[PDB]
Amino acid sequence: PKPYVAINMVEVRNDPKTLELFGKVGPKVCMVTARHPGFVGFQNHVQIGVVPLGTRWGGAKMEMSQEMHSLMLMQYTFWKNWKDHEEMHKQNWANLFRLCLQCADQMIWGPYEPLYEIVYANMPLNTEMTDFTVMVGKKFAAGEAVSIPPISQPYGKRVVAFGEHIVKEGLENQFEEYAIKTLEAFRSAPGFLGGMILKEIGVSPLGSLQLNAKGFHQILETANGMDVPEPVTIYEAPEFRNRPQRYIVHTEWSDTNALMFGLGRVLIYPEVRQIHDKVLDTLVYGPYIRVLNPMMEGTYWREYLNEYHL
Amino acid sequence: PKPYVAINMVEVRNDPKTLELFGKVGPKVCMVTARHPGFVGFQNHVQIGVVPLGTRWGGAKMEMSQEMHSLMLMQYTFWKNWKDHEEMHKQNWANLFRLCLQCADQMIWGPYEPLYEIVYANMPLNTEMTDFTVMVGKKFAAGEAVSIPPISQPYGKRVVAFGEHIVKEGLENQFEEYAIKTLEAFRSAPGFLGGMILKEIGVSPLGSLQLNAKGFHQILETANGMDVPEPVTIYEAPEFRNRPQRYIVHTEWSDTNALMFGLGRVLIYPEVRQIHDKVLDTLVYGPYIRVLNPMMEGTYWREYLNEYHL
Amino acid sequence: PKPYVAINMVEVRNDPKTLELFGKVGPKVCMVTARHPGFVGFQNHVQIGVVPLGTRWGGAKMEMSQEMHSLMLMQYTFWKNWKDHEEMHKQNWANLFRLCLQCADQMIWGPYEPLYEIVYANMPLNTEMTDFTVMVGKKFAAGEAVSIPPISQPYGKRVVAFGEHIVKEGLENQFEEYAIKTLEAFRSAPGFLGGMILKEIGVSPLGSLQLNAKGFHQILETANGMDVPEPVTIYEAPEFRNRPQRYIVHTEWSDTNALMFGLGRVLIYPEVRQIHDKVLDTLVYGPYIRVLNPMMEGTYWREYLNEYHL
Amino acid sequence: PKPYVAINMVEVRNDPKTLELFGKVGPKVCMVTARHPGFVGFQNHVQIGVVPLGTRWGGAKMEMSQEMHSLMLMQYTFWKNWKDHEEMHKQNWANLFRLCLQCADQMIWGPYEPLYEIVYANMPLNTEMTDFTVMVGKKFAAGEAVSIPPISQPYGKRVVAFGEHIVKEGLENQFEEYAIKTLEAFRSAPGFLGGMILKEIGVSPLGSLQLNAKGFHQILETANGMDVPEPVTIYEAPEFRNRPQRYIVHTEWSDTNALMFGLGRVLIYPEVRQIHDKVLDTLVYGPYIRVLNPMMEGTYWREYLNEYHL
Ligand SMILES: [Fe+3]
Ligand SMILES: [Fe+3]
Ligand SMILES: [Fe+3]
Ligand SMILES: [Fe+3]
């Protein structure tokens, strides 16, 4: 079934010290998160660029990463129920807070952790190029040759388009209908690996290090987290539901050229342009498309979604 | 009286080509804006850093600017009525659109242009060090020695703290009361040059290049703006009023040390810490404090605010 | 009272030999000029740049001086009566001519020496930063706190805007009225140090090395001025009064940023733009604004103007 | 009213790692200290040199800092009652101990934290150069033109003379009388910014990491303070009151030349030399004068002392 998604957003220094530190701390955070039986996996991204749409963001490129002093991270965790994420943070607050503060000397902004429901998902199981023989054999044996997925390679071997959209009050149904029809049209595009539409439903206070005044002071005063703030918040996640309605349109692509020309169908393929025009007519903000590299992931989140495995 | 504020937010390449281009285009945009009789001046900023609050954002510094591949700009325009800003953009769309696109090859994100009401302002006239004799003489002649302002030097010779806050629904009155009391306490801090509290009331669609589908395509297709999009929007500014309520707490300081230790009173001076704790107990997001350099400005916005001049 | 002004204009090589030579000869010319009891002081300038007004003169900058192979000098002398200047040149012709020819191997153009009446002056006494205590004390003791001037620092520690204007026949009264109202509006601008409006009334033949044919040959033939031309002219200064009417709008500023944003009020502050539009509607030429550095000066010309001293 | 003073004394490596670490840890220690309502502010110093008094310490200079492998820090905290300091250390022992040990790899000697009563204080509010207009205006409006203080700039923009004195038993009253008369004479010296006389009344055991045997072992054995020693001491602060009586004569100066020639009045101005000779006749040790730079400070301690603010 469809999980719920938490996206931990942080901006960190683009330094070898930061790469090394996150490679040591990130796995520990995933191990703590996996103490909760509602956790069904994760997908961690580094922003590598921006889709320029001709010259609209002419200072940007799809691969800018080398040039940048900081990195935006978008760390997705997947949950059977969105309250499972909030419960996991409360139950594991001390260990999580301490791991979060190991990243302290590297952080510029965040963490900020919006929570999402999935409106639509066409997200296949990941497979390595070594695995396609197994996937083809098992799909043929089940009489499902017609629904064999593309090869969506894990661990940094494909790219993500992270499309930010904010929708005028009352046009949410129109946005969802025509964003789904757009993602269905992308199934024709070479190197399309799937997509999903995320609808923001709140912001995690503990995931965002947002406490009451006493907690805020304890966060600032702690010697590397040894001194644990009391995790008392002034809100619960649904009380920070941004309006107007935020969506992320998340698509996955073999590489940045497939992304550019595949997403480009909304501009250059008249029949797809007509569908996506209905999406554009709902927006107060966007589209703004970040290019992400999905580096570290727990691909079993898609086994939960699709209710099968290889 | 209190003007309304539009803050044009953009992220641009940190290049000599971008510095030169903005120094040529920026003044022209100000001249077009000044065609509207509701325009009362402007204050343009470049973000130079982040207040780290000890190690909370330990990868940031108050002066990071040299290290960065891109710059955030926050370009304030001041208006007798917020609708004057919307009318100016509509009446001058072609010339503004074309100037905005000269910056095209330098832009990474934006423009995004929220509109604000001023809740509170203690913002003196700017003066050069050469002017303090005039300011002192005129104040003494009026028997107003008690209200002589500090010397708030224009054109890059002071710094700004840009404090982002998002307030839980129903706690806006509490936030405003205690944010005002905090800014009043800052009058005791060495190098405090004034502050104001901005309350977000909408987002300018034309200022944010947010049009209907037809307009969006014309923006992407134009050869440097010669081809002018039809400025038809799917919303007006009040239909993009973010909830929960956004505020900017804008303070001005002689230098970054005065900023750090002056703002720091909310953490290290017990009587001020007790005031600001009431602000902290209202927040769903923040505080997050950007350090800005106010470079190009039309200081006469403060003549409008304070209803006098030297 | 208002003196009359002679502005000796020359273009010289931008060389260390030229800087050294002018530093030795300039003071001697001032000492010769001071033989005449009508001489009330001087203010010598080097042009350092041009106000570009956005991209209108996009090859220019306010500080270009380093990049230039030649320098324009504008050497102001101040006189109780304009005929005093002409009498001084006639009475001191040999010594002045010989000092002028010491600069010979450095001159590219000039000298050209227009004469001016002052239409309007708001030009304070100069003071060093060490003097402001005296200036404040003396003004307070006189009950004149309201009219304390800004600190207008002498000897290269401020900048000058030299605004060239040529006015259509019959629109001189309109030009003068609204140029005065513009300079009055500049009193509100940070770092404004005063201004004056100069109206060209003739050209000095002896100051311009303009003699009859016999004199011209003696100028060309002289061995460094030992051989003195007979100072016979074919005109007197009022017979070279340019039409249409030339004006210089001379303003003084703390620094080039204060100059750019202060003069900029005629473009970006709607109420001042409306005043200065009446000036623009009188022009056949201009505005063209040179940026000058007032290096060597006899500040006592302002003691004569203002009829007081510290 | 007069606060009491704790001076935390440590010697640390003069390394970029030590500068960075103290810039991150110091603010956190101040925030923990500010949990106690008796805390009224702080003034942290780095020793930059020694007053050589001709050739008496001829190997020393007033600015030696660049040449040195280690730095002496003198971190002043100010308290309504000296017991407030002892209570703050006891109540916040775990968080303070952990922050103190983050500095561990940089420490050579200390911490050693004597406690003081203020015998005499002439210590103005600090002001930035931007603030002097406000300070002058508010003092004139209060009828206190006669008592306007000098501009004592915060955050590393002045220097401190830290004068060590030890007084023969029975000569304390003579020392205090003539040390006060000496500091009154310094009001005549250019660049004098105030002074105070501190009389040592004890040593903080917790501030000095002086515990019983069990605590000492736990201090040595702790993994970076995670393992918290039991804060059991063998003495209270008044049981480590050094005899004979220690004083610090603390004076503040615009710069090191004003310090040298201003303090020098006790040697070179006969009438002041006669006053200070009465101080010299009381000493068993001293004077020994360290030159300090007051870098990070909570200037509101002077608002408590003087019972007003700007
Ligand atoms: Fe989370
Ligand atoms: Fe705008
Ligand atoms: Fe002349
Ligand atoms: Fe202590």
Residue numbers in the entry:
A (entry chain G), B (entry chain B), C (entry chain E), D (entry chain A): 2 to 311
Cite, word for word, the article reporting this structure.
The crystal structure was determined at 1.73 Å resolution using a crystal belonging to the cubic I23 space group. The octahedral iron site in the StSOR crystal structure is similar to that of AaSOR while the iron site of AtSOR was five-coordinated with only one water (Wat2 as the opposite ligand to His86). StSOR also has the three conserved cysteines with distances to the iron atom of 9.5–13.0 Å, and Cys31 is located on the route from the central cavity of the chamber to the catalytic iron. Electron density maps around the Sγ atoms of the cysteine residues clearly indicate that all are mainly present as free thiols in the StSOR crystal. The hydrophobic side chains of the chimneys were clearly observed in the electron density map of the crystal structure. Due to the crystal packing effect, the chimneys have relatively low B-factor values compared to the interior regions of the hollow sphere.
Sulfur oxygenase reductases (SORs) are present in thermophilic and mesophilic archaea and bacteria, and catalyze oxygen-dependent oxygenation and disproportionation of elemental sulfur. SOR has a hollow, spherical homo-24-mer structure and reactions take place at active sites inside the chamber. Here, we report the biochemical and structural characterizations of SORs from the thermoacidophilic archaeon Sulfurisphaera tokodaii (StSOR) and present high-resolution structures determined by X-ray crystallography and cryogenic electron microscopy (cryo-EM). Each monomer has an 8-stranded β barrel core surrounded by 10 α helices.
